[PDB]
Amino acid sequence: TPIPEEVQQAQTEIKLFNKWSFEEVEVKDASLVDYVQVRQPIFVAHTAGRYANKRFRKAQCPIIERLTNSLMMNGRNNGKKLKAVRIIKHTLDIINVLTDQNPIQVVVDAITNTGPREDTTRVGGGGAARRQAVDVSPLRRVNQAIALLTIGAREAAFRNIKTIAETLAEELINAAKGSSTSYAIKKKDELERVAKSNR
Amino acid sequence: EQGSFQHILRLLNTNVDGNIKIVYALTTIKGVGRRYSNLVCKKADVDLHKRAGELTQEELERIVQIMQNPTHYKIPAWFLNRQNDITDGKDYHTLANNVESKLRDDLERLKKIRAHRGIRHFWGLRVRGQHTKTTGRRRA
Amino acid sequence: KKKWSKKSMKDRAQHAVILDQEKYDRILKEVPTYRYVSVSVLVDRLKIGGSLARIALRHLEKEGIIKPISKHSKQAIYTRATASE
Amino acid sequence: IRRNEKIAVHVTVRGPKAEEILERGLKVKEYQLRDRNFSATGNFGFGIDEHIDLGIKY
Amino acid sequence: MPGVSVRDVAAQDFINAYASFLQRQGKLEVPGYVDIVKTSSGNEMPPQDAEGWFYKRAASVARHIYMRKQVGVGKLNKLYGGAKSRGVRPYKHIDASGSINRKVLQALEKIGIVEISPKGGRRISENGQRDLDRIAAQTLEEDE
Amino acid sequence: SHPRRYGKGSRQCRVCSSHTGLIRKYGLNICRQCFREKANDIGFNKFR
Amino acid sequence: MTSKPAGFMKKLRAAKLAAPENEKPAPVRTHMRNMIIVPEMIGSVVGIYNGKAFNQVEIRPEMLGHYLGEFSITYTPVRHGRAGATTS
RNA sequence: GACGGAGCUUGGCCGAGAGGUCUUUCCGUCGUGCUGGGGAUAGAGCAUUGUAAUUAUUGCUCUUCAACGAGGAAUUCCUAGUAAGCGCAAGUCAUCAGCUUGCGUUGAUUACGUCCUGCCCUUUGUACACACC
Numbered sequence A: 001t002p003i004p005e006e007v008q009q010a011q012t013e014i015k016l017f018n019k020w021s022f023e024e025v026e027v028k029d030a031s032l033v034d035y036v037q038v039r040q041p042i043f044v045a046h047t048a049g050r051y052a053n054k055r056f057r058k059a060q061c062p063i064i065e066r067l068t069n070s071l072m073m074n075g076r077n078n079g080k081k082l083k084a085v086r087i088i089k090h091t092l093d094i095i096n097v098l099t100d101q102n103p104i105q106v107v108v109d110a111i112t113n114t115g116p117r118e119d120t121t122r123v124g125g126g127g128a129a130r131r132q133a134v135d136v137s138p139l140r141r142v143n144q145a146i147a148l149l150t151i152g153a154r155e156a157a158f159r160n161i162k163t164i165a166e167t168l169a170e171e172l173i174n175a176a177k178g179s180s181t182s183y184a185i186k187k188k189d190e191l192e193r194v195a196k197s198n199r
Numbered sequence B: 001e002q003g004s005f006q007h008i009l010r011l012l013n014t015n016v017d018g019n020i021k022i023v024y025a026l027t028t029i030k031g032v033g034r035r036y037s038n039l040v041c042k043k044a045d046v047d048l049h050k051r052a053g054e055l056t057q058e059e060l061e062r063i064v065q066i067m068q069n070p071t072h073y074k075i076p077a078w079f080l081n082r083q084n085d086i087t088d089g090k091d092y093h094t095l096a097n098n099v100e101s102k103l104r105d106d107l108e109r110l111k112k113i114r115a116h117r118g119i120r121h122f123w124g125l126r127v128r129g130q131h132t133k134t135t136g137r138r139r140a
Numbered sequence C: 001k002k003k004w005s006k007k008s009m010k011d012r013a014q015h016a017v018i019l020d021q022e023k024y025d026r027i028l029k030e031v032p033t034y035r036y037v038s039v040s041v042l043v044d045r046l047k048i049g050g051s052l053a054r055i056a057l058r059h060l061e062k063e064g065i066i067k068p069i070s071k072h073s074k075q076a077i078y079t080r081a082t083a084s085e
Numbered sequence D: 001i002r003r004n005e006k007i008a009v010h011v012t013v014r015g016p017k018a019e020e021i022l023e024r025g026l027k028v029k030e031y032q033l034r035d036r037n038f039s040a041t042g043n044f045g046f047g048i049d050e051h052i053d054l055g056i057k058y
Numbered sequence E: 001m002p003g004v005s006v007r008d009v010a011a012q013d014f015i016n017a018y019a020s021f022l023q024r025q026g027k028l029e030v031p032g033y034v035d036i037v038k039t040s041s042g043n044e045m046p047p048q049d050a051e052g053w054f055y056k057r058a059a060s061v062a063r064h065i066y067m068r069k070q071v072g073v074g075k076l077n078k079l080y081g082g083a084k085s086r087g088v089r090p091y092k093h094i095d096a097s098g099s100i101n102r103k104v105l106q107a108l109e110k111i112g113i114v115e116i117s118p119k120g121g122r123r124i125s126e127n128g129q130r131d132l133d134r135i136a137a138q139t140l141e142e143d144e
Numbered sequence F: 001s002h003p004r005r006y007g008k009g010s011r012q013c014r015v016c017s018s019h020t021g022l023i024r025k026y027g028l029n030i031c032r033q034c035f036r037e038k039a040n041d042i043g044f045n046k047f048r
Numbered sequence G: 001m002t003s004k005p006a007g008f009m010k011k012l013r014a015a016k017l018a019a020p021e022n023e024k025p026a027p028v029r030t031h032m033r034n035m036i037i038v039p040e041m042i043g044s045v046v047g048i049y050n051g052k053a054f055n056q057v058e059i060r061p062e063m064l065g066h067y068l069g070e071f072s073i074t075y076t077p078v079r080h081g082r083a084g085a086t087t088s
Numbered sequence H: 001g002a003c004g005g006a007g008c009u010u011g012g013c014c015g016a017g018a019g020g021u022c023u024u025u026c027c028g029u030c031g032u033g034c035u036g037g038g039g040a041u042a043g044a045g046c047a048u049u050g051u052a053a054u055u056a057u058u059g060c061u062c063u064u065c066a067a068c069g070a071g072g073a074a075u076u077c078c079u080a081g082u083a084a085g086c087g088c089a090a091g092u093c094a095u096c097a098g099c100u101u102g103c104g105u106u107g108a109u110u111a112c113g114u115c116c117u118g119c120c121c122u123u124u125g126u127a128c129a130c131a132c133c
Helices: A030-035 A063-073 A081-099 A103-114 A138-159 A164-175 A183-197 B022-027 B034-044 B057-068 B097-112 B116-123 C021-030 C039-046 C050-063 D016-027 E011-022 E054-067 E073-079 E098-111 E126-143 F031-036 G019-023 G026-030 G078-083
Strands: A123-125 A128-130 C036-038 C077-079 E114-116 E122-124 G055-057 G062-064
Touching: A030 A138, A063 A081, A063 A103, A063 A138, A081 A103, A081 A164, A081 C036, A081 C039, A081 C077, A103 A138, A103 A164, A103 A183, A138 A164, A138 A183, A164 A183, A164 C036, A164 C039, B022 B034, B034 B057, B097 B116, B116 G078, C021 C039, C021 C050, C036 C039, C039 C050, C039 C077, E011 E054, E011 E126, E054 E098, E054 E122, E054 E126, E073 E098, E073 E122, E098 E114, G062 G078
Parallel strands: none
Antiparallel strands: A123 A128, C036 C077, E114 E122, G055 G062
């Protein structure tokens, strides 16, 4: 005889903190969508050493997993995962609360906007150093997107009287709505400015 | 309902910090740690949460008396005569001016002692022998 | 330094922000744009202190005008209103 | 090098105005203060912050 | 469900519930020892009154005891506390905890809660489990 | 003729003449490396 | 003014030899005089010998030891013995 | 993050810390403050190791409250339980900053390639041959 966990007395049970659904989330960009896996996550975590393999579609990824991990990290020093998950658990809820839309969908929207079209590697050749503009490679767009969004959130927390979760929500929403106030979009638009020009 | 409030304190002499809660505010009083500070509040009978600035006049006046010497605690110098200098005066609290101006004397006293601690005070050098591989570059 | 105000508790005690102005303007006015907003986002946008927003939320809670949920870091969400369900 | 500008500021008080400031003013600075502070003239002066005196610091 | 709940709730909701019951005991004499700085560097007592210093230290220790046992003065002291080796610039913390433990343990002996071994440490009595378990009865109903 | 003392302290082999050393076994800290090959004690044969 | 046996210090008190101890009451009876050439740090300071000529030889130089009013509640070797601040 | 409380070795009366023995991760607190940051330096005084602690013990009650606002020209490694971070015990050792050193615990990012440096084999040239110093 029961007692047990309270959820719904069931159906298919949506997990992802038990709060939100992943399947509804659309990646508009046809190119981008392929790399971004959301055919069947939750939020628990996991490593798996998928290996670098190149050219064709490389590995599995969860967007969320990447976002928590960047936060613990950047930065700099001395961040633990129990706090790092916690801040996101709350951040997702702040984001949902601001938008009235699925937090994963906003995360997607942020990342797709912040991920530039083109970049600007620095090559020495002959007697001088040129930038000819360089590939984006679809995971690297994603990685850069998250990193940029993540530095911005940190920068705000440090400077202003705000906990991370809100700085992270704010920076993400702002990117997710195409406003230059976010660090992440401002750098995207710069990086694509420089890459187009330097050709 | 107010007070038209803000606060300026002399406190010990000429000093104001303020705008923080009394226990934490008090630590900044020369003489109290976090460790001393909380005890003085409850002995005075002011709450922890209330700011050192925010208080009414009677509560603030009790702070001035209590901190310098309180009811249940007290320390009078005792010993037979002499030793003369320096002495301990039974752990002066008494902190603030009387502590800072005490060590100024204690130094000359330590010199009239002929201590090394007194000769170094005369030599002028880092007192208790610091390392020289590197350091002191901001200091001078 | 630059300087420095909203600043609490002394402003909290005196009438100027507690009475009406802060609870009605800041907390209550924000809510019609977003049904819920987090206690900490709400701190930062309003420019109101975390401690300062916290008692105001609590008065409002008692009233039944707002309803909080929780989380440890005294973060949570703040909601006003809501319904027929 | 400009000599026309305000380098400083001063107050002359006389009479009761002088006495009320002397009352608070003497009270900070402890005493029995020294005779050396006094001039040949029968004058004395001491220095200290404005902050000393019953006054709002704010 | 309740008795078993002494053992099986998350510690805090247990300690919070329990501390109000403790509050009733006559004892709770701190006599001025606490006042110096019991622990690392900002440890004083005025937040102690609700579930402080002293009162959580008892309430919980009892929560700990039920599950575990046997114990002693030593066992208690760092259970809570640090005192890590120092890269020699530090402290993190100094937890003393030699005075602290002694004060908590003393009160308990007077009421009759805790008993003392020759080799073993601190054991719980018939008296000690009874109060813990009986209060636990109230706890579970509130929670669900 | 009278007597003397002071500069007591730890131990070292005969096989090597230096004071500084490791006590458990009873020889000096290189003598110990020579000894480590030998095996003598339960353990050390070699290698890690 | 008045003296009592007993004196406080920090964890310094116990047995001993004799060799500097024995020499020190001699300047009392004979009267004030030459400095006393003792390296020996070992002796805790006591009130009886106060205001008398002393020496210590750390190693190469002599260093005049004089006992002051102020040099009382000290340890003896402290002054000239600590520094060797023989540099400028 | 910083604070407090909370998730050769004793038992236990008893201690400011250090000790002596009859005796075997939640929540008060923080307001992003050169401070509740940081602990530098200073000074008096107390116990233990030792015969001694002053240039040359360690622990500090207590109080001075130092620079430093994340670091130039520049560097070192590291290819997933690895970088980086929390501690502990061993050895050291009468004492001793942590040396050197192993156990667990926390836990990330990038890993295509040879696209300044070390190397390999072949290749040619060589006026070098203790050898491009």
